[PDB]
Amino acid sequence: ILTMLVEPDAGRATWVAASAYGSDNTTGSEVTGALTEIHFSTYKLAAKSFI
Amino acid sequence: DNFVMPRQRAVTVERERQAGKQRDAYYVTQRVNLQRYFENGVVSGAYAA
Description:
This is part of a larger assembly, with 2 copies of chain A. In chain A, about 0% of the residues lie in helices and about 20% in strands. Chain A contains no helices and 2 strands. Chain A has a two-stranded antiparallel ribbon. Chain A is rod-shaped and about 90 Å long. The two termini of chain A are about 35 Å apart. The interface of A and B includes residues 22 and 27 of A. The PDB classes it as virus.
C-alpha cells in the first residue's frame, strides 16, 4: 500500500467593523485546517497453459 | 519639620505591547506616603457649621 497526502482547501478572513478596533476582535477570526491522505493498491492478473 | 516623605520606588514608566489588540499599553507606578514623627503639629480652621 502507498499512502499519499492531500492538502486541505482554503479559508477566508473577516472584515472587522470599526467599533471593535480596540477590543480583542481586531485580529479577526481564526482559520483552521487539517491534512488528509489517500491510498493506492494493486490486483493480480494471471493465466496458464500446458503442452 | 515634623513630617517626612517615606518612599520605596520613584516614578517609573513601563510600556507593553498587546499584539492581540495592537494597542501599546503604558504603565506608570510609584510608591510613596506621608508620615509624621509625633501626634501633633497641624491646625486647620473651618467655616461655621
